[PDB]
Amino acid sequence: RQLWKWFGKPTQRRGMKGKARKLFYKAIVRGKEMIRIGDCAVFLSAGRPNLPYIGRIQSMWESWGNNMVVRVKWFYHPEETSPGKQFHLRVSSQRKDFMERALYQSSHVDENDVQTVSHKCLVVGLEQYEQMLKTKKYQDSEGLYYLAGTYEPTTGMIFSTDGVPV
């Protein structure tokens, strides 16, 4: 549908003019929606849309040839972690919407086309999430997730938000 475009002027430039030039931007806009660096977003994916690609935006830039790029730090759904779904004491204390609403942060970063961004979402701490659920706007939790810890895809290890290997 409609394309994301840059908001305003670049924040920074790298390289000489020409094929090596890179113009960095803090925000993209589409109609009345704005997404900025530090926000989390849902990305368009190929299939299985119960596991949307969700990432934190680290930086965005345009390179030569009208290429709009976003650098993304991916979150992982608990099903996606190598311990799988069956792995999810710790089981007792976890919310009953854990499989649907919890996300692990990771250090897995990728560069992607800005036009694969679908829409903004929120990934907050557990206590923040529970307080937001008491309200009316965030009643229904649309696009709202909470952080369950860290996943290391290279080792398969999961860590709590306190850094405790799980």
Binding site: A46, Y53, H108, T116, P153
Partner: peptide, 8 residues
């Protein structure tokens, strides 16, 4: 662009 890509 059509769909995003993930490495591993």
């Amino acid at each position: 662009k059509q769909t995003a890509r993930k490495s591993t």
